[PDB]
Amino acid sequence: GPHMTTIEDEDTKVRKQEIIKVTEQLIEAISNGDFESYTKMCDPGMTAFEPEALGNLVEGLDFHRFYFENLWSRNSKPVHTTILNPHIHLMGDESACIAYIRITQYLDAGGIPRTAQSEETRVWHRRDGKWQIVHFHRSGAPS
Amino acid sequence: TIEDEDTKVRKQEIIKVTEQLIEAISNGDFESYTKMCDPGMTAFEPEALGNLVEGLDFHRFYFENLWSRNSKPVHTTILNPHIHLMGDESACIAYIRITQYLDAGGIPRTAQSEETRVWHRRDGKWQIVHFHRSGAPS
Amino acid sequence: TIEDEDTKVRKQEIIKVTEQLIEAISNGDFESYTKMCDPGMTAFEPEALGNLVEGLDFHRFYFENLWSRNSKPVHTTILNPHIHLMGDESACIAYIRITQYLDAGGIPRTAQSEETRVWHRRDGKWQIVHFHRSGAPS
Amino acid sequence: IEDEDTKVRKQEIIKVTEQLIEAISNGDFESYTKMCDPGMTAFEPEALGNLVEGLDFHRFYFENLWSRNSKPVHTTILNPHIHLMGDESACIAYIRITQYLDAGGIPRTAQSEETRVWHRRDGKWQIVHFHRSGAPS
Amino acid sequence: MTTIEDEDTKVRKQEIIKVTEQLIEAISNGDFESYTKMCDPGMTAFEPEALGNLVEGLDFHRFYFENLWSRNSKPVHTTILNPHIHLMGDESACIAYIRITQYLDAGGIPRTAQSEETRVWHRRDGKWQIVHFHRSGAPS
Amino acid sequence: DEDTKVRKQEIIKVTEQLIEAISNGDFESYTKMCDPGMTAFEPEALGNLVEGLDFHRFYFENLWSRNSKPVHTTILNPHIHLMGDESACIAYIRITQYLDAGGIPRTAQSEETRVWHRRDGKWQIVHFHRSGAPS
Amino acid sequence: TIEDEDTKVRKQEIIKVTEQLIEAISNGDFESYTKMCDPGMTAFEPEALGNLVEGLDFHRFYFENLWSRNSKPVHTTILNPHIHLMGDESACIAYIRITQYLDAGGIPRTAQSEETRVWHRRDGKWQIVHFHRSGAPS
Amino acid sequence: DEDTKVRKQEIIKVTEQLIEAISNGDFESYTKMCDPGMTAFEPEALGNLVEGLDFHRFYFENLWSRNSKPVHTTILNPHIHLMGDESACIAYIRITQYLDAGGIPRTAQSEETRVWHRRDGKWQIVHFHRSGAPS
Amino acid sequence: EDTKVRKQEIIKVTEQLIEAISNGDFESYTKMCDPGMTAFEPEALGNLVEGLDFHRFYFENLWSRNSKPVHTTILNPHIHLMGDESACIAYIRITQYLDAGGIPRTAQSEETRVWHRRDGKWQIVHFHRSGAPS
Amino acid sequence: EDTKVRKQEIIKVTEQLIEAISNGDFESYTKMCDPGMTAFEPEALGNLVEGLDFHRFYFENLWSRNSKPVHTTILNPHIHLMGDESACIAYIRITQYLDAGGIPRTAQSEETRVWHRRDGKWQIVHFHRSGAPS
Amino acid sequence: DEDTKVRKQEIIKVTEQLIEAISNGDFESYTKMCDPGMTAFEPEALGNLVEGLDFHRFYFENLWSRNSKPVHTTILNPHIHLMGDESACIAYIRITQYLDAGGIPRTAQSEETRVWHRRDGKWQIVHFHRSGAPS
Amino acid sequence: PHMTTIEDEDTKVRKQEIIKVTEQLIEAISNGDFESYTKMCDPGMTAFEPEALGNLVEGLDFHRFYFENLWSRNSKPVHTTILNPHIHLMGDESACIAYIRITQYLDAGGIPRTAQSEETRVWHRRDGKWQIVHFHRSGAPS
Amino acid sequence: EDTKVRKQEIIKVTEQLIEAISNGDFESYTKMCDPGMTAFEPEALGNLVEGLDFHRFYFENLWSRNSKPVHTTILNPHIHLMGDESACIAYIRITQYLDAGGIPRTAQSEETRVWHRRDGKWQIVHFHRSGAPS
Amino acid sequence: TIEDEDTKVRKQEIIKVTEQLIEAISNGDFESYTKMCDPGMTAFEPEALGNLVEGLDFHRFYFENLWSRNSKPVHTTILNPHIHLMGDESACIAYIRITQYLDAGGIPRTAQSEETRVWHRRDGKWQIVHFHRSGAPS
Ligand SMILES: [Cl-]
Ligand SMILES: [Cl-]
Ligand SMILES: [Cl-]
Ligand SMILES: [Cl-]
Ligand SMILES: [Cl-]
Ligand SMILES: [Cl-]
Ligand SMILES: [Cl-]
Ligand SMILES: [Cl-]
Ligand SMILES: [Cl-]
Ligand SMILES: [Cl-]
Ligand SMILES: [Cl-]
Ligand SMILES: [Cl-]
Ligand SMILES: [Cl-]
Ligand SMILES: [Cl-]
């Protein structure tokens, strides 16, 4: 279009929104204890670092399934999630990386509104059309 | 039909640059470091107090203020590495970083941290586009 | 040139909307609240754990899960207010917010917080475009 | 094409904020006052919960704390957000991270949330109010 | 030489001590109506409950009145120690004293609280009103 | 009535003057500004109501060592109450910026009430109440 | 110095009044207490938090608000008494006051305090002119 | 007529004198003012009733940082009880302003009771009770 | 050797004494105590008490004898016979009780008892208990 | 009146014993102590000690006397005479000292000294100390 | 080669089997997998080297409550060392996800070393060393 | 005779063989002699120890640090005791030894203190000499 | 040949002793102890105790000898034979028990038992326990 | 009396050797210590951390590096000794061992501990076959 003297290419804008959407979708699946949708979004050889893994690098979805079968009783109180200061890094058409602060507003524990924070890194890989998480790193203490 | 073992060498490729990156960090060599980082590099680390930091500017300070690291031998070990290849220009490595240092009463101590490094191939050389360090140690 | 009498009423104007805003917050009236906030409202507050929050989405939680304050009588006082007028569509107010509440053993307690509210006049009514709170109200 | 002047207006605000921070960081009180409205208002850890007026209260840290002749300082402005309000009024909120030494000659990091309210007067931008949360400086 | 006019400063001071006692009784009985009657609308105050802030009006004080009824049953004895009055004109007085409160608690345990108080009085249309007060020593 | 405006500024000026005298360890000027039967409540008096200026003479004799610490005072949120033409009352937050305490800039806060009485032309403090830190 | 050893029953009278006085306090008998107290009596005691009190009003509060002497059987001991006869109209006695009480669950406990009682004879009956207590007991 | 007024001032003067002697570590003047069978309750005696001046002698002989330091004492809210012409009782708050701790000004409070007995012309302390911490 | 029987004697009255303590039997206690008795014990807070008066309170205001297991052990006792009518016994007193912990707890105390014979029976003229163990 | 003197007699030896202790003179100490002297003191850690051998140590490793002014007071002495040959004194021992920075401090201890007369002089047979001081 | 690959998987399988038996409180299967003269180091043994299976019977026999909370085990970063055809050594991180503690999900970690010896066909544990928490 | 005092007799010497190399290994460690140490360890040696913070470490690289930065192990007397040893023989080239390692050392001001640690050493015979293939230390020592 | 069986003999009586203790069976216990038995154990607070009287408190006031699943292990035993009527055994005593809500825990204590053969049966003449069990 | 009672002589012989043993320890006379200890002697002591030690090898270390007695005097007291004669060849002695040492800070201090010593005599000489200590001396 007009104004050729500059990168009129803002598909990077929509590509990033693409990544933000799948991340939101992933979080919703997690938040609703929907393990099926979750696995659908994760690469089988998915790798992860998270408080629940006590400093160990975990492989597969098997380890996460636990929390999706027991704590699945997730439905016991309201839980609003906010993704702050997102930053996406595009790497090829099949590879993306997103880092953001994850803020969770929940009740319970004494029945009072409380807020939890965690730093998250999600590494995305495009396979046969849909984006899948290949690795993620969570920092803080919340799930 | 022993096919696809170049993934084996590609992963070793990633392990080597990660080792190189850690050595540069460990030797306070900021020049080599920047050479290995994308200008728009993003990071999550204890020193950033929960904030997502951009650029190398924030890291320069720690490189310049430790200058004489010699005041103690520093050995690093990369444990249980795991590489994820994504295209020919994109890689992801996750490992436990163990650091053996002295100081603190000249006594030998060990620090652990979980690290994620996201690599992107630009014009021949690999560069870090994002990294996430969990723990608190150095 | 003491025509600075309208600045007197302009400031009272700002003090009134601030009082109105606080009342809406105090009564858990999220509708009135949103009516007074710009959609792209920005905020710094204890509940946000050091993060700059955007939109009203983050606030509608405490506005929809914090009504158990009837058995917890509340009174708010705005102390030492200071308004800064900037054009006819832009104002800034800073004050100490003191809250008297019960509970914590049916006993009377007092909380203090420093607040900054940035106001912008849009199509007739004043709206908050950004606010910064220090302390820990709710 | 135009609709990107808000883009340059915001960069304008980010520049004066950077300039302000540099003046503070270099203990240059003259440049500082030049950038502040005489009736400037402020909330900051050093004021112990009180709303302070004028630059008189700040002169103290530029004087009795310009003794940085023994340690270098680096400042980072994170996740900036500007709100434009008319052509003479702006509002910027950011996380201010400070890397300083001492405390054992060791590298340490400080964080603080800052809000700066800007007003355009006779050409140059001036701070009319600011709110600092956390502590750092 | 100074018999008359001195004998009256004596009664003027007792006058101030009486209103101060009355004020304290109203406070002690949670009687906000009598309290407001004794305070100037633009009354100013410094007190532990205000966390280092100068408070205006009676609005801030109503809270403690309305939320301290059980005290009705709670026996309360107040003592005003080492009073000092400063007369300033016929319509202006200043009194400073140590306020000691003897109260019970849970288990009916007797405890004592101390606070230094300054009350500034102004005569308006016949009755004395508090224009400013300063309370120290964290007690209520 | 606006002379109330100048009357209040009058009180603010003497208060500033008083603080300056205190800040400079100038006991002569101080006594000149205090009524002989001056009464006071302050942290240094440990909960006791002190009389006269005698008790304050000491924080002047042993604090004059100020030639080792620049001091700046700020009077915040002042509020004056006028009561007759010879009686005033001022309440304010007193913020003090001082060094030492290691050598680093520090800030102290205290709430102060000063009761003023006009005697033979000049204003004199008849009572004062300080709560906080400042000495 | 051996003549008129009456300074034996003289001191003994003082212990008699001091003992009476202590019984009144122990039984919650304000009337007896006042009879032995000069209306202009002053006191230093832990309950007065460092202040010097005058009159009997201050002490009345502990009598009026403590009638449960029922489940409150209390024993008192006056250790190492020392009387100072001043003239024939006055006396001063100092002793340790040990009191054994229950409560504290119903377990036996002991408290101690130093007391000074300054007596002065008005008419034929003695009265407490001033007293000072240190320690625990009330 | 009010001789009770002068009698009380008489007691206040000897108390001031006593405190000065104590403050200056002048044990001779002190003993001169105390009855040989003097009794005492004080923090330094750990809950015990002490007799004679022997116990106090230590604090003089071994506390000379008193001489090397400006010490200011204030007697607050004094109350005297007269009992006959040879017997008096005074109770007051004793406030002490001293330096040390690096030349820092600090304040100490103690409640004191002094029992006076007139013997052969001069007043002597027969018993005293100090509550708090001073000496 | 005749000294062993006269010492064993003292042990008997000491045991007898402790026996009465634990039985709330104040009457037997008084019989064994000299009216001018003196004492240093934890429940006296560093003061020397005189008489039996100060001791009734614990006899009366605490008869949880058949409520708790009051068992006392006298260890390493040493006796000093001083003339025909004067004895000194010093031992470690070990008590094992219940409740107030509900657990079988053990308490230790150094105890010195000074005896003196009067018209036949032995009586305590002074005792000194250190540690705390009631 | 005769008792008045005998009791006062026990107060003198007690003070002399203390004098010798304070002084650091062990020769005097032994002479006033019976060989079989038994003791309970804070340095024995709950143990009934026997003989002089255990106290010698404190007599040889605390000679820094002058290097510390020390004043003792004996409060509320109570003596029990038990026949011509034995006595018992109980008192509060208050000690005023410095050191630890030269700050005048005050220690307290409950003491019980049991005396037995051997020919000319009085000898301590047993003693009990509570608190911690000497 | 390529058999060292299957030999190691062989060891990983018996280790998994062992852990399952432990996890299900199945002492019979456990003993079947342990050499009678089995040696062990583990937190429950308080620093002592224990012999036989007798000592382990207690943790099985007395924690049957497992039949309540889902127990999931993960073997992380396994490392096998082959030594001859009848001897193997495996070291791994053992992560256990369990409930309880309020029916709340919690995770325990422990470092384990298992020494295997082939006897008459089947692999048997000859010694094991546990660091950490796990049952 | 009773068919065993021949074989039982060599298992006896084989176990002493293992106890000797273990003692040798400990001496090398105790003297900060990294060369002898590496000589006794298989290159692919694996280890679990307090210094590794719950991680399984590989190679000798990680241990080099405690040898090159522990030259003080040559300044003060160090006595080691191996208690309640237990050897498990597995083939002629494979052995396993478990023991309590007690260390008596000074300092902290020349003060004598004792440290305890449970150790497991897995030995493998390669080309004549015994080498450590894996070890697990729980407790403290080093 | 026989020292082997003599030692097993000692290990058996020690096991029997521990079982009696573990089952709160004081009768069997006393049967196995010499009347003048001496002991050092945590419950005695650093004091050397005599007789069985002191022990009858822990067997007695602890009738939860069921509600406490108890397994005992004797580790690294070492016997010293001294004559045909005297033996000494030292071992680590490990106890596996449950809890305040069935939690499995382990306690360790070092024990020394000194045995003396009297009229046929072995009796404990002295024992020393370190740790805190019973 | 009876041929017996001389048992006190046997008991006293043990008190003699026990004292000789303690004295040898304090001197730092390992040689004598060896002659007094059976080579297969067993021990329980705080310096062993819960483990039963055997032989005299483990104790050597203390007769070498522990030289605070080799330059600072210490007095030992044995209290309430109790002996059990199991024969003419076997003895058992139990006692509290108080130790008065100097420094540890410089101020005279006292340490306690109970010790059990089991003695066995071979060819005329008494030797300890086992000992158990509680507390922490040497
Ligand atoms: Cl996740
Ligand atoms: Cl980095
Ligand atoms: Cl808000
Ligand atoms: Cl600023
Ligand atoms: Cl009020
Ligand atoms: Cl002032
Ligand atoms: Cl009273
Ligand atoms: Cl004095
Ligand atoms: Cl008793
Ligand atoms: Cl002594
Ligand atoms: Cl297992
Ligand atoms: Cl090793
Ligand atoms: Cl037992
Ligand atoms: Cl030994």
From Swiss-Prot, chain A:
Subcellular localization, as worded in the UniProt entry: Synapse; Postsynaptic density; Cell projection, Dendritic spine; Cell projection, Dendrite
Post-translational modification: Palmitoylated. Probably palmitoylated by ZDHHC3 and ZDHHC7.
Annotated positions of the Phosphothreonine modification: 5-6
PTM-bearing positions, type Phosphoserine: 73
Self-association and partners: There are 4 genes encoding calcium/calmodulin-dependent protein kinase type II chains: CAMK2A, CAMK2B, CAMK2G and CAMK2D. The corresponding proteins assemble into homo- or heteromultimeric holoenzymes composed of 12 subunits with two hexameric rings stacked one on top of the other. Interacts with BAALC. Interacts with MPDZ. Interacts with SYN1. Interacts with CAMK2N2. Interacts with SYNGAP1. Interacts with SYNPO2. Interacts with SHANK3. Interacts with GRIN2B. Interacts with CACNB2. Interacts with LRRC7. Interacts with GRM5.
Protein role: Calcium/calmodulin-dependent protein kinase that functions autonomously after Ca(2+)/calmodulin-binding and autophosphorylation, and is involved in various processes, such as synaptic plasticity, neurotransmitter release and long-term potentiation. Member of the NMDAR signaling complex in excitatory synapses, it regulates NMDAR-dependent potentiation of the AMPAR and therefore excitatory synaptic transmission. Regulates dendritic spine development. Also regulates the migration of developing neurons. Phosphorylates the transcription factor FOXO3 to activate its transcriptional activity.
Family that this chain belongs to: Belongs to the protein kinase superfamily. CAMK Ser/Thr protein kinase family. CaMK subfamily.
Descriptive protein name: Calcium/calmodulin-dependent protein kinase type II subunit alpha
Taxonomic source organism: Mus musculus (Mouse)
Residue span relative to the full protein: 336 to 474 of 478
Curated annotation (Swiss-Prot), chain E:
PTM annotation (Phosphothreonine): residues: 2-3
Protein origin, superkingdom: Eukaryota
Phosphoserine PTM sites in chain numbering: 70
Compartment list: Synapse; Postsynaptic density; Cell projection, Dendritic spine; Cell projection, Dendrite
Post-translational modification: Palmitoylated. Probably palmitoylated by ZDHHC3 and ZDHHC7.
Signal sequence, start to end: none
Subunit comment: There are 4 genes encoding calcium/calmodulin-dependent protein kinase type II chains: CAMK2A, CAMK2B, CAMK2G and CAMK2D. The corresponding proteins assemble into homo- or heteromultimeric holoenzymes composed of 12 subunits with two hexameric rings stacked one on top of the other. Interacts with BAALC. Interacts with MPDZ. Interacts with SYN1. Interacts with CAMK2N2. Interacts with SYNGAP1. Interacts with SYNPO2. Interacts with SHANK3. Interacts with GRIN2B. Interacts with CACNB2. Interacts with LRRC7. Interacts with GRM5.
Annotated function: Calcium/calmodulin-dependent protein kinase that functions autonomously after Ca(2+)/calmodulin-binding and autophosphorylation, and is involved in various processes, such as synaptic plasticity, neurotransmitter release and long-term potentiation. Member of the NMDAR signaling complex in excitatory synapses, it regulates NMDAR-dependent potentiation of the AMPAR and therefore excitatory synaptic transmission. Regulates dendritic spine development. Also regulates the migration of developing neurons. Phosphorylates the transcription factor FOXO3 to activate its transcriptional activity.
Family according to the record: Belongs to the protein kinase superfamily. CAMK Ser/Thr protein kinase family. CaMK subfamily.
Protein name in the entry: Calcium/calmodulin-dependent protein kinase type II subunit alpha
Native species: Mus musculus (Mouse)
Lineage of the species this protein comes from: Eukaryota, Metazoa, Chordata, Craniata, Vertebrata
Gene: Camk2a
Span covered, complete protein: 336 to 474 of 478
